[PDB]
Amino acid sequence: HSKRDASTPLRSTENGIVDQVLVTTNQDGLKFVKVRVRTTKIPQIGDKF
Amino acid sequence: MIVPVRCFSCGKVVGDKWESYLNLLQEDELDEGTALSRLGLKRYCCRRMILTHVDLIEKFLRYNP
Amino acid sequence: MNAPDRFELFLLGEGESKLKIDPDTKAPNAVVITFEKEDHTLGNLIRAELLNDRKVLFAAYKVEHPFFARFKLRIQTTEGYDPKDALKNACNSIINKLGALKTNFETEWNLQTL
Amino acid sequence: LKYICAECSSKLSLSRTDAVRCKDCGHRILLKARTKRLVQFEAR
Amino acid sequence: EEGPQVKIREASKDNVDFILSNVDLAMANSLRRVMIAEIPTLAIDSVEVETNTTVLADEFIAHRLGLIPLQSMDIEQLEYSRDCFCEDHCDKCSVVLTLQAFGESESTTNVYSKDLVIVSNLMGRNIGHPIIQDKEGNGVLICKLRKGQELKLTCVAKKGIAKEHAKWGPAAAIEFEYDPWNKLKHTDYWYEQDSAKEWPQSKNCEYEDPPNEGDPFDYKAQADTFYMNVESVGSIPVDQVVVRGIDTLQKKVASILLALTQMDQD
Numbered sequence: 001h002s003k004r005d006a007s008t009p010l011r012s013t014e015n016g017i018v019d020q021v022l023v024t025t026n027q028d029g030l031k032f033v034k035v036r037v038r039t040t041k042i043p044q045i046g047d048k049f
Numbered sequence: 050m051i052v053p054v055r056c057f058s059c060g061k062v063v064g065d066k067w068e069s070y071l072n073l074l075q076e077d078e079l080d081e082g083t084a085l086s087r088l089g090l091k092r093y094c095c096r097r098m099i100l101t102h103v104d105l106i107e108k109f110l111r112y113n114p
Numbered sequence: 115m116n117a118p119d120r121f122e123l124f125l126l127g128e129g130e131s132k133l134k135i136d137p138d139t140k141a142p143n144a145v146v147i148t149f150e151k152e153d154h155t156l157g158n159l160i161r162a163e164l165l166n167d168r169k170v171l172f173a174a175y176k177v178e179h180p181f182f183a184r185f186k187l188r189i190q191t192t193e194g195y196d197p198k199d200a201l202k203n204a205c206n207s208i209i210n211k212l213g214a215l216k217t218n219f220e221t222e223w224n225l226q227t228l
Numbered sequence: 229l230k231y232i233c234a235e236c237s238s239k240l241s242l243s244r245t246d247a248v249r250c251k252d253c254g255h256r257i258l259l260k261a262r263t264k265r266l267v268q269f270e271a272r
Numbered sequence: 273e274e275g276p277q278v279k280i281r282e283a284s285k286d287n288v289d290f291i292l293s294n295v296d297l298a299m300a301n302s303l304r305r306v307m308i309a310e311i312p313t314l315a316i317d318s319v320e321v322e323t324n325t326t327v328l329a330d331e332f333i334a335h336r337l338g339l340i341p342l343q344s345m346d347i348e349q350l351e352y353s354r355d356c357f358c359e360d361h362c363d364k365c366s367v368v369l370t371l372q373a374f375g376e377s378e379s380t381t382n383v384y385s386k387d388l389v390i391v392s393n394l395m396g397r398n399i400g401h402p403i404i405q406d407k408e409g410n411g412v413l414i415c416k417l418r419k420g421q422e423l424k425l426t427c428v429a430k431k432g433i434a435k436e437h438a439k440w441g442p443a444a445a446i447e448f449e450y451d452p453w454n455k456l457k458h459t460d461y462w463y464e465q466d467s468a469k470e471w472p473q474s475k476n477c478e479y480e481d482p483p484n485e486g487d488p489f490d491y492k493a494q495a496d497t498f499y500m501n502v503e504s505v506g507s508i509p510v511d512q513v514v515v516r517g518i519d520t521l522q523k524k525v526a527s528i529l530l531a532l533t534q535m536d537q538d
């Protein structure tokens with residue numbers, strides 16, 4: 001066990017489909033990632049209008 | 050986005066009438082009322098469905114990705 | 115999220131029977147029948163057809179909650195007249211009327227153009 | 229695995245220990261390619 | 273015949289304007305309800321997307337495909353996937369049709385419903401074919417591709433009821449009106465001055481006799497004459513819409529009758 005976990009979990013209450021994944025270095029030369037997840041929401045009982 | 054396939058209220062197909070509608074506005078030079086009337090959209094819910102719609106996909110296609 | 119399946123409106127669940135006939139304790143010679151996976155479409159018609167039977171004292175349907183596709187139908191007939199027979203007569207009458215209506219529409223349709 | 233650049237129609241296959249940038253471009257904005265395992269959609 | 277009567281005032285491929293005579297209100301209403309929802313129809317239920325580089329989202333396009341009117345003529349000799357003894361789906365329950373579109377010209381490449389190609393074996397059944405009431409013969413405008421955009425997917429269409437989803441709706445709007453002169457007085461008209469002048473007169477008024485002021489209110493009269501106009505979408509012809517409506521109502525009544533027949537078991 002030479003590694004600590006630092007994984008990012010999906011929102012506990014939410015769900016959907018991985019829309020797009022972006023991998024890019026930073027200004028200081030740091031490999032960082034932005035993952036956009038898509039979820040289609042349909043008007044349900046209780047939705048505010 | 051793009052023209053809705055069918056009317057929300059009743060359920061009449063309207064997606065096949067979009068381009069035609071546009072033609073009726075630019076080719077025959079008609080007003081929106083007569084153009085909507087000629088397409089067989091008598092009920093004002095479908096009439097709304099086409100008249101009220103904004104074709105945003107034409108602006109979406111402007112990007113290269 | 116917590117929304118029920120759509121087919122639960124017409125597909126019978128596990129163990130759920132179509133009709134649940136129960137002896138009414140209120141008035142004598144009465145009955146309450148639970149119709150599952152059916153709505154006003156059937157209830158209103160059956161109830162309205164039960165009122166045509168002049169040997170039926172009472173007939174009324176109701177949907178206790180719009181969430182669940184089901185309705186209760188209370189029937190009360192005269193003595194010497196089982197309510198199930200009233201229901202059956204009503205149903206058969208409905209079927210006959212619908213058959214005649216279908217036939218008439220079919221004959222009227224063949225006489226049309228465009 | 230493989231990736232695809234943002235502002236050009238390329239198809240990089242550079243795995244780890246590579247990343248940025250892009251082949252014949254210059255920009256560092258790299259996107260990930262769509263999965264091969266298909267997903268079904270209940271058309272409703 | 274002997275029971276209820278029909279009088280087709282107008283008839284077309286899309287609409288049928290008729291009059292129901294000698295019928296109870298509940299039967300007309302129930303027929304309307306059945307025609308609206310409870311009628312079997314074929315529509316896209318499953319969508320498998322391979323490549324989708326278009327603007328529109330996956331489930332967006334999928335939802336658009338779900339609403340596409342497909343041929344449901346011989347739908348009665350098709351089967352529900354829930355009833356078929358196969359795995360997932362087969363040729364006895366579902367109709368599979370593919371869709372392959374790609375941006376070719378510099379101009380916008382339109383993707384219509386005509387681009388859908390039937391893949392599964394129809395084995396002699398008139399089914400699955402997307403209805404095209406379009407004048408140019410294109411059909412429903414599904415999507416729009418740019419220059420290098422590609423849309424590749426497959427559609428598994430299954431038999432379904434409009435009660436489960438409105439995409440399986442065989443009819444659009446059903447016109448319904450009884451007693452145009454309010455002789456039954458089921459409606460207390462709202463007004464500011466004159467009740468008759470403010471409220472527009474119905475067309476169906478031309479098919480009934482106006483009330484006489486010298487005559488009192490007819491309290492023993494019910495509703496016999498009903499003016500209806502059924503409009504189909506294309507999946508099923510109008511005449512067959514109302515006919516299969518009647519047949520469906522009758523059938524689901526017969527199911528209750530059968531249930532009563534079965535409850536006699538010890």
Ligand SMILES: [Zn+2]
Pocket residue numbers: 056057058059060061092094095096
């Ligand atoms: Zn409408």
Ligand SMILES: [Zn+2]
Pocket residue numbers: 233234235236238250251252253254255
């Ligand atoms: Zn590049």
Ligand SMILES: [Zn+2]
Pocket residue numbers: 353356357358359360361362363364365366
């Ligand atoms: Zn099958």
